[PDB]
Amino acid sequence: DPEVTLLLQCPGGGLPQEQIQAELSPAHDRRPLPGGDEAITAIWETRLKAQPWLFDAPKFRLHSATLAPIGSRGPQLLLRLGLTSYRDFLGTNWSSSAAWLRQQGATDWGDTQAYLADPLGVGAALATADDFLVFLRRSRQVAEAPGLVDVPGGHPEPQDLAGQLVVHELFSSVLQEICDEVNLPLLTLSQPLLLGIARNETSAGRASAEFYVQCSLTSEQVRKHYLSGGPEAHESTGIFFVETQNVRRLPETEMWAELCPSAKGAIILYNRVQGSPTGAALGSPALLPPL
Numbered sequence: 305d306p307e308v309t310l311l312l313q314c315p316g317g318g319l320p321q322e323q324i325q326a327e328l329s330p331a332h333d334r335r336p337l338p339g340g341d342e343a344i345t346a347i348w349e350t351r352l353k354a355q356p357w358l359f360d361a362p363k364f365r366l367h368s369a370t371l372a373p374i375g376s377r378g379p380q381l382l383l384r385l386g387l388t389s390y391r392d393f394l395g396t397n398w399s400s401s402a403a404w405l406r407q408q409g410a411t412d413w414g415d416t417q418a419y420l421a422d423p424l425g426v427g428a429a430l431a432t433a434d435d436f437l438v439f440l441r442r443s444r445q446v447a448e449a450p451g452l453v454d455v456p457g458g459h460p461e462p463q464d465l466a467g468q469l470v471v472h473e474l475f476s477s478v479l480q481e482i483c484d485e486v487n488l489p490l491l492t493l494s495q496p497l498l499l500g501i502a503r504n505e506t507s508a509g510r511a512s513a514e515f516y517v518q519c520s521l522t523s524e525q526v527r528k529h530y531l532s533g534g535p536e537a538h539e540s541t542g543i544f545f546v547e548t549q550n551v552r553r554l555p556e557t558e559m560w561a562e563l564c565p566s567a568k569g570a571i572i573l574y575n576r577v578q579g580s581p582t583g584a585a586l587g588s589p590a591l592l593p594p595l
């Protein structure tokens with residue numbers, strides 16, 4: 305799967321909020337472009353003169369993520385984060401010249417991402433009470449991954465001593481994206497666990513944090529809540545469910561070619577971190593069938 309690379313696989317079946325530290329620093333920002341950020345401004349002007357109802361928004365930038373030695377006490381993950389924007393994304397990662405910026409970054413800074421906005425996404429492996437994962441169909445009329453299958457998520461917007469507020473906004477935002485798009489009550493959702501971080505190589509390497517969230521509703525109740533919002537209550541054009549039993553072999557199915565890269569990330573990390581049992585009981589042949 306060339307379109308997705310794993311940057312981080314979390315231990316212990318996934319990390320809760322209380323085990324993560326963030327360092328939010330201007331040292332973690334995008335570097336100014338070699339010929340100046342005028343190139344970004346020019347692409348933005350062109351875009352607004354065709355779609356003048358568009359608006360900029362701030363975004364978190366992922367610089368890097370360092371895991372503690374496995375089995376250790378105390379904080380287990382440090383997220384190094386800067387600030388970017390939708391405007392910077394359109395002028396770098398989404399640009400036709402994104403590959404040239406990656407090569408220049410290797411040359412100038414020894415870092416393929418040095419000149420890229422790299423806004424941090426969030427996604428969820430959302431499981432039902434009757435043991436299905438939730439999938440959404442994208443419109444065939446949007447610019448990114450039209451007509452492809454996605455999981456719930458988005459790109460959160462800003463507002464250890466400012467760090468803990470940043471980790472809280474990241475975990476909060478995955479729940480908020482589930483409530484906005486699936487139309488679920490917040491009280492049917494578990495506190496999220498961070499499974500890992502996945503890179504979209506089709507979008508010049510921008511990263512998404514992938515979370516596990518459990519819902520107390522069955523698949524039939526989740527469907528009712530989704531549909532009862534009506535066409536204007538969601539961006540997606542349909543919802544569907546795959547048994548967790550069948551998610552194990554999803555990369556061998558015809559569905560795999562229809563999944564956008566970030567949803568592939570979420571499924572690979574669910575299979576490695578929540579699936580793949582380590583103990584004698586769940587690892588027994590009757591409960592973990594060979595092949």
Ligand SMILES: CC(C)(CO)NC(=O)c1cccc(Cl)c1
Binds near residue numbers: 363389393423459
């Ligand atoms: C077309 C829209 C407005 C749909 O939500 N695009 C985004 O919000 C978006 C996509 C990729 C990256 C970042 Cl930062 C934003």
